[PDB]
């Protein structure tokens, strides 16, 4: 749902209680702490973008 | 626009530096003598003819004393305070200081 | 007005400076908007055919 | 299958939907405040302090909240108080009915994107309609636009007097502080009059003293307590026994010195005390500190000595008595000197008692006739709503005398806006007339919300008003309709420029800005996630 | 266990009626813990203390001020009686007392369909017209008259328990309070906090208290071979010790001779001979310090035949200063001759109880006092002390303030009758409050007529008769007998200031109370 200028925007809080909102692909997937080993490969495929 | 990284503040040597008072008047001769080396320094800084100061932070040593502060305020020379070791190469190229 | 808009306004202006990068790295553009998609999904069929 | 972060994720109407309740829940605060018909607010602490206030931003950022939804319309009151000065209770009713409004907008499958774009166009729209309809500056009301901008701010408060006695004080403080600068920049720095409280008399034997007043006391009960034609020496230094440097140490080996040595400690010290004073100084005022030894001299001389008052007190002291702050010895290579021409002046420095306690007072000073305030209440209660009322009104009238431009209250400039933006929405409508016609819906929460508070009629009341703003505009008779509003104690229109209800422009215009990003960065937080907390590691 | 969705997690609130009507019960309930402590026959009330004392007292904030509430409204009416000690003297019992009628009223209009708004713009009118009566009713006082000064004190502390020896305690307060009436530069002020010292000694009875012509301290001599009575002693008073200290700084002496050891020794002897010789270039006969006395500076000022007094606190030696005149002099270097205290007189070091006391009293013209109690326990002398502490007060009110308005309730009713008369013509929704400040007004009387026993029907429905008419105006309650009397022979009058406070606290009180619509509580603050 964040593709195009017609997309939306995500909010995510850590287990600090930092809110962030953003947009940007790369800064969703750092916040998102995906755990399983090969879902977080498309972590390190956004760091190269 | 003056970058300055030599501390405005009493002598200090890498050796530990201790000074005895062991007379009457001494006592008044190591206040007035460290009162006339603040002094000047700040002398060859308004005879250089700057108007403003960058002061580099400093962790060992007084980036800037209260004395030199006074003088300095004495001279019309404006003094930003508590630049990082960060900001030298930006700051630098901007202004055009060494 | 809002640390949460500041901080998202930081990003954006990140990603335009990198599109102009681009642009002096490889000094050629195309068409956005799926154009890319559309036409490799076609010639890509071709080519498998 | 599932996601596979630790936390919860709650995407669509979930989070739509919650995002607008934690709003609202904020809403269901302020709007009870609204108006000079609301009333007080009480919050209590855990371990028993209690607080009574009717400041909207106080009262939020006093209460705890947890959605990151309802911080913003926490942080959105502290704009104002930064932007405005008084305005911190609509621009959070304001915010969550645009909110509420978008709400019903989208759930009808109208992309969010098509909303905001509309809450944009409306608001820059409105905001020129605002610039176009304005009242008068300053010039033709006088005094008047700054006694009645004055009462209007504080009919909302405690001090909501129906006299001039608090008004006076508020305008004609602000007004004797006045510094011009290059460029045209008529200065009045409110934050230069010292507001000071007292559990004493009644709130209308509160003192408008010309000069300063400072927080502390003269001590040695052999000082005189009142000097008239004194010369002040303000000074940021110690008057104590003189200490030796960490780096310098005294090692004798000639016993017959130790005398001589030792007592220089307290002969260094006496040499500079003594030439403070055989300048003429008749009050020495210090940030640091004197010790027993060195107010002996104070008492024999006849001077004053006032000692550990905050630096902030000090230089403001000082310019308004024309001293300059000495903090060492200099000029030109001099041991001593103390700057004997650079002395204050004052008609009069004396300690008065202020219901059993003690107050300094340095008079009209001869170079800047500053102010201070003395505020007088039953208890601690009243006073601490007194002095934050106060700085509302000093504010409030701050900005009546940068920005030359009143617009009416009592609801008038958002009934004028409520037939305008309607037509408006007819001009451009092809597919955001929804969102242009409930942002112009929006803006009716505020006479709605003053009816209510006040226990009038609401629908046909404010409907009334409606009717006067829409024949101003629809008849183009010049019938001069645009700046009637709602009489909350009579329930009836009054036409606000013959009774005196303005307001800053800036007021309405920055509050609309604000109200309305705050909103559009809201309503794009459809998906949220939300991670387990880190307590123990 | 998921949580739920809230905001300001573990937070009560309250709002609308349950408020409006919650907080005036709680001031009620305030008041009526002191409404039996108004009038000429109050009882005693024997708190027990959380310290783990006994506080036996009838003076209304006295006990208001030891009770502690969790309300947070009771919480305001309790510092209303705590302003009101530090404001004014009895300004205390009948300001909680009204405060609390006024309220009363207004819980009646609260559910008539009357805006909050009327109630306290209704209040706020009648102030000015109450404060405005009490300043025309007003009667002029002649302070230099001794037997004016004596009525009005003896009735001040008829009310309180101090009353049975009313011929001890009148002399008492009005010459401490005229003691300190010091005027140094261009300022008059009546100082009974810093020179108008209260000291107690359990036994004896209050028959030997008295007012002490200068002061006393709780010391001893500092060496028995020095003299322990002299007529007139000149007195010097000084701030430094008569010790050798090091100084600040980081000496260090180098000893390498057989000499320099017992060298150092000698000039720490002689420092102190030195500066001891100081301090009898005035030739004193009583030297007066606040540090340690070293045993040489002992030895020389016994040779010396001067008495000493070793550790004096800051605050008695400021005490002295003024009754003796003697200046303060830190340094002996420079003492000079106008810093002797001339004109003390005796010098006495009694033993009261197996404990020395010394004295200097019967001074020629003090400026400061003390007042020396005696009692059969502490329990009487802390009565007495607490009640002699009012009855200075109300002297500076008179002295600062010379008017009086007549007590006994003569003043309230003929205030709540000036109200009535203009209630007339009000001629809007405010007319109903209004009036109810005029009948608020009578707690007052009625209260000082249920403390004697008295009936509530007919001296009041008589009171009320009798301010009809032009000819008196200053009728009021007789506590004693349970009659109405004319205060032109009753002669109770109370200070103009006490009244004007009283009806300005009580009003703003109500104001502040009534505004509360909702209560949020559980919060935490940084």
Redesign the interface.
């Known amino acids: 749902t964040s593709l195009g200028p017609k997309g939306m925007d995500k909010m995510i809080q850590d287990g600090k209680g930092d809110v962030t909102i953003t947009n940007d692909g790369a800064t969703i997937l750092k916040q998102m702490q995906v755990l399983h080993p090969a879902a977080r490969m498309l972590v390190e495929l956004s760091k190269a973008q | 626009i003056g970058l300055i990284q030599f501390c405005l503040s009493a002598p200090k040597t890498d050796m530990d530096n201790q000074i005895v008072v062991s007379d009457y008047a001494q006592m008044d001769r190591v206040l007035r003598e460290e009162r006339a080396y603040i002094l000047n320094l700040v002398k060859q800084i308004k005879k250089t003819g700057c108007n403003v100061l960058l002061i580099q932070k400093s962790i060992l040593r007084d980036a800037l004393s209260d004395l030199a502060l006074h003088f300095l305020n004495k001279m019309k020379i404006m003094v930003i305070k508590d630049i990082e070791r960060e900001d030298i190469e930006f700051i630098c190229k901007t202004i055009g200081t060494k | 007005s809002n640390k949460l808009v500041i901080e998202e306004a930081e990003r954006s202006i990140h990603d335009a400076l990198c599109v102009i990068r681009c642009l002096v790295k490889k000094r050629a553009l195309i068409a956005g908007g799926g154009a890319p998609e559309i036409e490799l999904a076609l010639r890509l069929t071709e080519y498998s055919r | 299958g599932p996601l596979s972060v630790f936390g919860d994720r709650s995407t669509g109407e979930t989070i739509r939907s919650q995002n607008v309740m934690a709003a609202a829940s904020i809403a269901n605060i302020v709007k009870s405040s609204l108006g000079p018909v609301g009333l007080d607010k009480m919050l209590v602490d855990d371990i028993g302090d209690v607080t009574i206030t009717n400041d909207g931003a106080t009262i939020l950022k006093l209460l705890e909240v947890e959605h990151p939804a309802a911080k913003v319309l926490c942080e959105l009151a502290d704009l104002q108080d930064k932007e405005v000065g008084d305005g911190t209770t609509s621009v959070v009713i304001i915010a969550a009915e645009l909110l509420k409004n978008a709400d019903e907008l989208v759930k009808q499958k109208i992309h969010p994107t098509s909303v905001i774009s509309g809450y944009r166009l409306a608001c820059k729209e409105a905001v020129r309609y605002i610039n176009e309809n304005l009242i008068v500056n300053t010039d033709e009301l006088g005094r008047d636009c700054l006694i009645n901008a004055a009462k209007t701010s504080m009919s909302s408060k405690i001090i909501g007097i129906n006299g001039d006695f608090f008004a006076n004080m508020v305008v004609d403080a602000v007004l004797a502080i006045k510094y011009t600068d290059i460029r045209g920049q008529p200065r009045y720095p409110v934050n230069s009059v010292n507001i000071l409280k007292a559990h004493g008399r009644s709130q209308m034997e509160s003192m408008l003293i010309s000069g300063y007043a400072l927080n502390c006391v003269v001590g040695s009960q052999g000082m005189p307590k009142r000097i008239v034609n004194a010369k002040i020496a303000c000074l940021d230094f110690s008057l104590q026994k003189t200490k030796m440097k960490l780096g310098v140490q005294v090692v004798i080996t000639d016993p017959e010195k130790l005398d001589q040595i030792r007592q220089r400690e307290s002969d260094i010290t006496k040499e500079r005390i003594q030439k403070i004073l055989a300048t003429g100084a008749n009050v020495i005022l210090t940030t640091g500190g004197i010790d027993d030894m060195c107010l002996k001299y104070f008492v024999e001389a006849g001077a004053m000595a006032v000692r550990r008052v905050l630096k902030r007190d000090l230089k403001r002291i000082a310019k308004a008595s024309g001293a300059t702050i000495l903090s060492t010895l200099a000029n030109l290579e001099g041991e001593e000197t103390f700057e004997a021409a650079m002395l204050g002046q004052a008609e009069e420095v004396v300690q008065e008692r202020i219901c059993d306690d003690e107050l300094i007072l340095i008079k009209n000073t001869k170079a800047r006739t500053s102010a201070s305030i003395i505020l007088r209440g039953a208890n601690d209660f009243m006073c601490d709503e007194m002095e934050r009322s106060l700085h509302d009104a000093l504010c409030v009238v701050k900005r009546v005398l940068e920005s030359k431009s009143v617009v009416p209250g009592g609801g008038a400039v958002e009934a004028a806006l409520s037939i305008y933006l309607e037509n408006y929405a007819t001009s451009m409508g092809s597919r955001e007339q929804l969102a242009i016609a409930e942002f112009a819906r929006s803006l009716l929460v505020i006479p709605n919300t003053l009816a209510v508070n006040a226990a009038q009629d609401s629908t046909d009341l404010v409907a009334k008003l409606r009717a006067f703003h829409n024949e101003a505009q629809v008849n183009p008779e010049r019938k001069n309709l645009k700046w009637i509003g709602l009489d909350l104690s009579n329930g009836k229109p009054r036409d606000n420029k013959q009774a005196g209800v303005f307001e800053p422009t800036i007021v309405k215009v920055k509050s609309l800005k604000f109200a309305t990003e705050a909103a559009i960065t809201i309503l794009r937080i459809d998906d949220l996630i939300k991670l387990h907390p880190e307590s123990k590691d | 266990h998921r949580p739920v ?5 573990n ?1 009560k609130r309250e709002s609308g009626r349950k408020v409006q009507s919650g907080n005036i019960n709680a001031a009620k309930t305030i008041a009526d813990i002191i409404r039996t402590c108004l009038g000429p026959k109050s009882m005693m009330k024997m708190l027990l203390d959380p310290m783990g004392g006994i506080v036996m007292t009838n003076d209304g904030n006295a006990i208001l001020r030891e009770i502690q509430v ?1 309300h ?2 009771a ?2 009416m309790i ?2 009686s705590r ?1 009101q000690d ?2 004014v003297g009895d300004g205390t019992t009948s300001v909680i007392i009204l405060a609390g009628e006024m309220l009363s009223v207004a819980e009646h209009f609260l559910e008539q369909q009357m ?3 009327v109630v306290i ?1 209704a209040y ?1 009118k009648a ?1 000015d017209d109450m404060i405005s009566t009490l300043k025309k009713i007003s009667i002029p006082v002649d302070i230099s008259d001794s037997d004016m000064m004596l009525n009005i004190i003896n009735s001040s502390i008829t009310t309180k328990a101090i009353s049975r020896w009313s011929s001890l305690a009148c002399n008492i307060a009005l010459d401490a309070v005229k003691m300190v009436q010091f005027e ?4 008059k ?1 009546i100082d009974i906090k ?1 020179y108008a010292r209260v000291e107690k000694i359990p036994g004896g009875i209050i028959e030997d208290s008295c007012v002490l012509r200068g002061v006393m301290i709780n010391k001893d001599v500092t060496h028995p071979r020095m003299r322990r009575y002299i007529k007139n002693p000149r007195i010097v008073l000084l ?1 430094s010790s008569l010790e050798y200290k090091k ?8 000893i ?1 001779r057989e000499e ?1 050891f017992t ?2 020794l000698q ?1 720490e002897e002689e ?1 102190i001979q030195q500066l001891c010789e100081d301090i009898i270039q005035l030739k004193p006969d009583v030297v007066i310090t606040e540090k340690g006395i070293s045993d040489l500076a002992q030895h020389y000022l016994m040779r010396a035949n001067i008495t000493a007094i070793r550790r004096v606190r800051k605050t008695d030696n ?1 005490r002295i ?1 003024r009754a003796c005149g003697a ?5 002996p270097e ?1 003492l000079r001759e106008d810093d002797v205290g001339t004109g003390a007189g005796l010098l006495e070091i009694k033993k009261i109880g197996d404990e020395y006391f010394t004295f200097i009293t019967d001074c020629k013209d003090p400026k400061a006092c003390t007042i020396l109690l005696r009692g059969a326990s502490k329990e009487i002398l802390s009565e007495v002390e607490r009640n002699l502490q009012d009855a200075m007060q109300v002297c500076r009110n008179v002295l600062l303030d010379p008017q009086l308005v007549p007590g006994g309730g003569a003043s309230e009713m003929a205030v709540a009758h000036a109200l009535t008369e203009k209630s007339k013509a009000m001629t809007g929704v405010e007319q109903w409050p209004y009036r109810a400040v005029a009948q608020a007004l009578e707690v007052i009387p009625r209260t000082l007529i249920q403390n004697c026993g008295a009936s509530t029907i007919r001296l009041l429905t008589s009171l009320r008769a009798k301010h009809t008419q032009e000819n008196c105006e200053t009728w009021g309650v007789n506590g004693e007998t349970g009659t109405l009397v004319d205060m032109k022979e009753l002669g109770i009058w109370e200070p103009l200031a006490v009244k004007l ?1 009283t009806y ?2 009580a009003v ?2 109500a ?2 109370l009534l ?11 940084k």
Do not use: C, F
């Open positions: 969705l809230v905001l300001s997690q937070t969790q947070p409204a919480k305001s510092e209303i302003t530090e404001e805006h909050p708004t713009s706020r102030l140094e530069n261009g300022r002020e810093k701030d100084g600040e700084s980081q000496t260090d002496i180098e390498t320099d060298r150092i000039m420092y400021n200063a200046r303060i002099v830190s340094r420079e406070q300005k606290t703003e009180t104001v502040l505004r509360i619509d909702d209560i949020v509580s559980g919060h935490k603050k």
